Amino acid sequence: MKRTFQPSVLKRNRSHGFRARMATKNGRQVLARRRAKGRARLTVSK
Amino acid sequence: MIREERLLKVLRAPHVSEKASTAMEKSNTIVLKVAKDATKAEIKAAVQKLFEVEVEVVNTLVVKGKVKRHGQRIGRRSDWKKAYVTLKEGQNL
Amino acid sequence: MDINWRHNQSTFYHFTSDHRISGWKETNAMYVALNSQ
Amino acid sequence: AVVKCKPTSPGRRHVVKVVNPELHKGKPFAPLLEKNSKSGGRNNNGRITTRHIGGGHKQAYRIVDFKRNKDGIPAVVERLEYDPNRSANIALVLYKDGERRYILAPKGLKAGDQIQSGVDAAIKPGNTLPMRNIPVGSTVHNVEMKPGKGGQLARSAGTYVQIVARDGAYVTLRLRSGEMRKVEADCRATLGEVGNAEHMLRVLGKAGAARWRGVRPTVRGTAMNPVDHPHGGGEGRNFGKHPVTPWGVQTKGKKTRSNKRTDKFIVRRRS
RNA sequence: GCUCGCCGGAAGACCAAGGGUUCCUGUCCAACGUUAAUCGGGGCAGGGUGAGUCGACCCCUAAGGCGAGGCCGAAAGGCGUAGUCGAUGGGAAACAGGUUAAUAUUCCUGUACUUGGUGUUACUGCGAAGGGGGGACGGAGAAGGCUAUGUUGGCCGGGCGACGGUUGUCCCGGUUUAAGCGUGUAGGCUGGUUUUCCAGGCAAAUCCGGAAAAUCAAGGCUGAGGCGUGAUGACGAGGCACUACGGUGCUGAAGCAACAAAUGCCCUGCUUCCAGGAAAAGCCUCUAAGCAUCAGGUAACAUCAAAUCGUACCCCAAACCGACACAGGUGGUCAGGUAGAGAAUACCAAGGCGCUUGAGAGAACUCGGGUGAAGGAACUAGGCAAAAUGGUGCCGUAACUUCGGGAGAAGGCACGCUGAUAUGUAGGUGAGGUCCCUCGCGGAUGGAGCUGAAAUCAGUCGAAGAUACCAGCUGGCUGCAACUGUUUAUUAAAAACACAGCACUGUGCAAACACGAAAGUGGACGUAUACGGUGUGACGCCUGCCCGGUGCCGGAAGGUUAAU
RNA sequence: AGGACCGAACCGACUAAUGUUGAAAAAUUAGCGGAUGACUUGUGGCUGGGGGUGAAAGGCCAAUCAAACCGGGAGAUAGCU
């Protein structure tokens, strides 16, 4: 059956990637919480 | 021209294997590990000027590093670059 | 194995399915309730 | 020429076509075409603002000359063409100085026919000229509402506007609505009536024909739940309410004009 | 290794996405593998991915994103002009053969092609975020010409055969060759050329558009395939010499023709139909400012450059998405034989597999199937399930009907094999020869050869000739819904939703209406034959009475009536 | 010609049986509907929570939907167990 995760790298990055978190106020606050929690990978880039 | 300070840092090791060996003893090509940011003009110039031979053409691939592990600790090795340097008819090394 | 066992015990903790008991177990409880009314 | 299709396969049983042998079978004139991307009924916020729109055939826009600015230069009608963006047909015309333009095609106008815009134009159908020079009681289409702006009244097929008065700097116009409106008399207008009247006689026949003009289905309000439409719910068919829009405003009677700026120009509302 | 079975429009082959070393070799069997394991997609180590031509990057753009200024907004921020990004689309160029354990249009051999830089030489008006062309583009249908590919004959090499026969109307195998370059064909489109003039293409224009003449009747554009060359080369069934028996080298015959033939190519064509079918760059042209014995343009030759990243391997799956080595999901490409209308179906080729627990026994019972005396719905909520029907041709076919249907109504008959008509016909294709020449990829004649239905008559076999697989059960009365469609992903596919059609009502354009503190945007580059809302729901005959209540529309006299 | 007819791919999901600590958190097998269209599909884009989208089922919005998920107010409150 066709499950929910149908992967695509270009949609992974355009959607949840770094240049797209940095592109706005609230994604920069996301990166700030991931750095402050101290996190090995911030976004999902590769 | 390429400066000689750049041109010394490019070639890194001769690559020893059996594909390399049959490339030397069968098709004049010496195979050698180069700098990761080394272009084909740099490798050609560096073999022209550091082994004093005449290079016909260079073919460069980039080899991806293998994820090994020690114990239960993984790690990728490291990517390197391998240059197939096709020499002319007059060569030794 | 321990991590997979904790997550695979954590599978039906937030479910919704009402005809299946506990999210997964097949039954006849629809007919039992419906016949009780 | 309207044509009833023979009833092979339902779907064709009720179709009436409006065929026109004088339309150009071929490609339109290219440098008066441009891209016309379809929207889906959705504004710059992405949201559906006008419902029921979407799909349909790909269409290219045709720059139709509504202004009719080339004054005094005659133009022969080169051909007539199908325009997908309108109810009427468009005539491709060729001015004497070698410029082609598309105009709305009036009623009698065929290929090889002289039209002429401007003040000293002859009064005959196809000639755009200001309404202080048109006689009272003449059918007139493609009417401007502000001088220099372009035609906006009576553009849709089979539609005309009658000039009934010339009191001063204004002309009283019986719009196709039935409404009497004052327009400034310097506003150009094209003589005759616009010419595909039989457009209204076609009957479409099946559901997919509506679909291919870009008209998605219309779910009626009473078939929904109360969360969706004010008509909603009720255990079989159940209306019981005064009929409203999906936003609660009364349909079936309730007047929704509020302008106050253009009420000066309305002599009598429609009836 | 020999047999046996399974897939073969896939369970073969090649990719994209996705993964990321799973690829290949050596080595180990702890754990992983639903068993054992010497094996493995497991552990460990080593190896492996070679590009001017493939793809990305790059040039150009769609939807859409972002957006200097800007308009707007308590702040955050919204929208958006110039612009700038964004492929799933447009834009230069390589093919055959060989090779590795593992890469190959990348390496090697042979033969090519493309775009830029620079230099020389000959001629020369060049020049844009500007003008024009072009790129540039729908659905369906129909043939015609081809090819891939296949079949048969010829040729060449080999065999004459475990059991009757098999020197022949016999058996097995091979019969392959590309890009590029040259020619220009079956088609398809368009009249061509010269001169003058002009309110158009923001300016200019020799370009485009337009208006006059004059002359010629042809020119041009495009185009599959074939043919020639590439190629006296490669490949080639097989033999020969050594053989770490794994193979390794050497040598190597024929290498043709006929017919059939695509869903591929001519074809972005042609015919037709409404529902009227991207953009921008490369490309070709025109000039403006400027530069004008310079620069630049064109042509030939030479020379240099073409960087960077991807390239392993799986990819309908044990490697991706499904927690699993999960009976599920996953886009594109190639598509042989026989029978067949066919990409169905049966059996097969190439190729790949036998599904990572086995050995027995042959109880009840469960599951998947086969058959069944007599009866034949008596079962049951209900013919649920099963059984039955099932092909092609011809005959024949009712009520009712919107004249289309109903209709494949219903119901029948024929069907294999052999021989003759006819040493294979009708038809298709069509050589050599002959005739003419505007002479060749020509047309006329001619029929050799190949292919080849279908029908009748005669005979013969079986219980049965649509023999397997595949492949309608039919009829009568009636409710609802007109019809095709849509819907409760995961107990409801329906009479429900939709629908064409009808009506009412709003709406005069800065439209009503909707999203939006606003700007703005959709409505719509539309304009009342249009658009929005509401109900009803093809079609036919129709749609009666009630305005007291609630709503809406209209009226303005009087009563009451806020801020002030 | 056709929201035409029969029928594969392709899309679907009408019936039955199995399965129901499944091979599978919705499938398999045998039949079944559509199959040139209101079709189907790939790649990208847009719409967002009292909001979207809806041929309307209160359906769908990441195995979640009469108001998603995450985090916080938050140790809500619980005359009840």
Numbering used by the authors:
A (entry chain p): 1 to 46
B (entry chain g): 1 to 93
C (entry chain s): 120 to 156
D (entry chain P): 2 to 272
Article sentences:
One of the most recently discovered examples is the Vibrio export monitoring polypeptide (VemP) that allows Vibrio alginolyticus to adapt to changes in salinity by modulating expression of components of the protein targeting machinery. The switch between SecDF1 and SecDF2 is facilitated by the stalling activity of VemP. In Na+-limiting environments, however, VemP is not translocated due to the inactivity of SecDF1, and the resulting lack of force on the VemP nascent chain leads to ribosomal stalling. Ribosome stalling dissolves the stem-loop structure within the mRNA, exposes the RBS and thereby induces expression of Na+-independent SecDF2.
In order to investigate which residues of VemP are involved in establishing interactions with the exit tunnel during ribosome stalling, and in particular to decipher the molecular mechanism of force-sensitive ribosome stalling by VemP, we used cryo-EM to determine the structure of a VemP-stalled ribosome-nascent chain complex (VemP-SRC). Since we observed a contribution of the amino acids in VemP beyond the initially identified stalling window and to ensure the maximum ribosome stalling efficiency, the wildtype VemP sequence lacking only the signal sequence (residues 26–159, ΔSS-VemP), rather than a shorter stalling window, was used. Subsequent refinement resulted in a final reconstruction of the VemP-SRC with an average resolution of 2.9 Å and a local resolution of 2.5 Å within the core of the ribosome. The VemP nascent chain adopts an extremely compacted conformation within the exit tunnel comprising two α-helices, located in the upper and lower regions of the tunnel, connected by an α-turn and loop. The α-helix located in the upper region of the tunnel is comprised of the C-terminal 10 residues (N147–Q156) of VemP and is directly linked to the P-tRNA and thereby located directly in the peptidyltransferase center (PTC) of the ribosome. The α-helix located in the lower region of the tunnel is comprised of the N-terminal 10 residues (M120–S129) of VemP for which density is clearly visualized. The linker between the two α-helices is located within the constriction of the exit tunnel, adjacent to ribosomal proteins uL4 and uL22. Structurally, the extensive compaction and secondary structure formation of VemP results in an unprecedented total of 37 residues being housed within the upper two thirds (approximately 50–55 Å) of the ribosomal exit tunnel, which contrasts with the 21–33 aa that were visualized within the exit tunnel for other stalling peptides, such as SecM, MifM, TnaC and CMV. Comparison of the conformation of nucleotides at the PTC of the VemP-stalled ribosomes revealed two nucleotides of the 23S rRNA, U2585 and U2506, which adopt conformations incompatible with peptide bond formation.
